[PDB]
Amino acid sequence: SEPMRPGVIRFGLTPVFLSNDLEVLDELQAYLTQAVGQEVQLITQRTYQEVTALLVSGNLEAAWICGYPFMKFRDELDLVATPLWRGKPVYQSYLIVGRDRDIAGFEDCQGDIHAFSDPDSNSGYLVTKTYLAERGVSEEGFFRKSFFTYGHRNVIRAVASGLADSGSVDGYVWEVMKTTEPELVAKTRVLVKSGWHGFPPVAAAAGQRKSQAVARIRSALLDMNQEVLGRSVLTRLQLDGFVETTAESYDSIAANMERVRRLG
Numbered sequence: 001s002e003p004m005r006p007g008v009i010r011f012g013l014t015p016v017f018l019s020n021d022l023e024v025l026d027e028l029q030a031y032l033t034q035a036v037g038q039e040v041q042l043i044t045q046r047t048y049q050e051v052t053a054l055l056v057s058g059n060l061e062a063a064w065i066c067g068y069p070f071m072k073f074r075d076e077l078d079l080v081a082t083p084l085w086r087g088k089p090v091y092q093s094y095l096i097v098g099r100d101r102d103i104a105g106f107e108d109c110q111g112d113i114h115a116f117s118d119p120d121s122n123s124g125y126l127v128t129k130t131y132l133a134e135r136g137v138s139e140e141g142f143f144r145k146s147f148f149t150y151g152h153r154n155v156i157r158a159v160a161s162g163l164a165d166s167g168s169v170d171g172y173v174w175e176v177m178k179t180t181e182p183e184l185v186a187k188t189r190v191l192v193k194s195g196w197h198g199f200p201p202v203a204a205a206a207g208q209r210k211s212q213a214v215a216r217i218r219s220a221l222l223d224m225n226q227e228v229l230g231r232s233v234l235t236r237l238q239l240d241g242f243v244e245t246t247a248e249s250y251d252s253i254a255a256n257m258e259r260v261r262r263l264g
Contacts, residue, residue: 004058009036009213012043012051012063014118016237017153017173018180024236031229035220036213046150048120058205061213066200067250068122071257074247078209080202081221081242082249085172089243091199092171093127095192096159106131106192114139114146115155115164122253123170124152127194130256133263153177160187172199176238198249202242 011032016024025042032040043060045051052069054060056076070077082089097103116139117124125148132142139146147164149155152173159167171193178185202221204214221242224230234241 006059006061009038009040009217010043010060011040011217012045012054012060012065014048014051014064015044015046015151017151017177018236020236024233027229027236028233031224031227031233032217032220034229035223035227036216040217048118052120055203055205058207060205061208061211062202062204062217064200064202066118066120066122067198067253068126068257069120070201070203071247071250071254072120076206077203078206079245079247080204080214080218082201082245083199083242084240085199085238087240089199089245089249090196091123092196093123093194094169094171094174094190095128095131095166096156096169096174096188097166097191098159098162099187099189101165101189103191109166109191110142111144112165113163114143115158115167116146116148117152117155117167117169118148118150121152121170122197122200122256123172123194124155124168126253126256126260127197128168130259131192133260136263138263156184156188160184166191179238195252197252198245201245201250 015021018024029040029042045054048066048069051063052065052073055063056073062080085091095106119125132138149158152170155167155169156174156177158164174185208214224234225241
């Protein structure tokens with residue numbers, strides 16, 4: 001009950017997938033500082049589990065996490081805002097293979113070495129795990145080996161370089177990189193696209209509905225197109241902005257989590 005507050009407002013995220021990442025991070029840190037009206041520090045961690053645990057335990061004010069970890073810690077978290085990409089707050093998981101790989105569909109990946117992105121990513125893990133669960137298999141049964149690359153861009157590199165025969169990646173990442181690193185991406189192709197799911201949201205700890213810091217962060221995200229600097233960050237990410245959503249937008253993820261739970 002003695003309150004504990006941080007020395008600065010902290011916004012957590014996982015590493016940005018772009019090549020000029022320090023530039024995007026600097027502009028985003030500047031934007032949020034400018035919009036919130038006091039210093040904001042960006043805290044990057046490698047994995048979704050680390051970002052999420054920091055947020056749940058009160059060591060961040062907000063964080064950009066995946067819908068999967070959000071749904072896992074749903075009672076301890078509140079949604080702040082969801083990104084818009086190509087006009088909509090949704091995205092797909094892609095199952096990718098080498099550009100010239102001679103195969104017809106998903107079942108031909110049996111026996112592959114498979115690159116997943118993060119065990120707490122919807123698009124880098126859970127969707128593919130759902131395909132497998134529905135057919136009575138798990139990654140250890142279906143693939144000869146699988147591994148986590150801890151980044152979507154890294155899945156693409158692992159498949160492009162031939163260390164993995166197939167991989168599971170965020171379809172937003174793959175499409176954005178198709179334009180920013182076209183020579184890299186041209187070494188892969190999309191074998192399977194999933195259904196649409198809610199785009200990875202920004203969330204806050206549930207004890208913080210009343211927090212002035214959370215409210216200002218929320219307005220900063222929602223108003224990000226109103227400022228030159230905010231537009232600049234959005235342009236580099238190819239996002240359109242942020243919108244308000246509710247947990248219902250993440251129901252297709254929760255439904256897949258339940259399908260996977262019911263695998264033996």
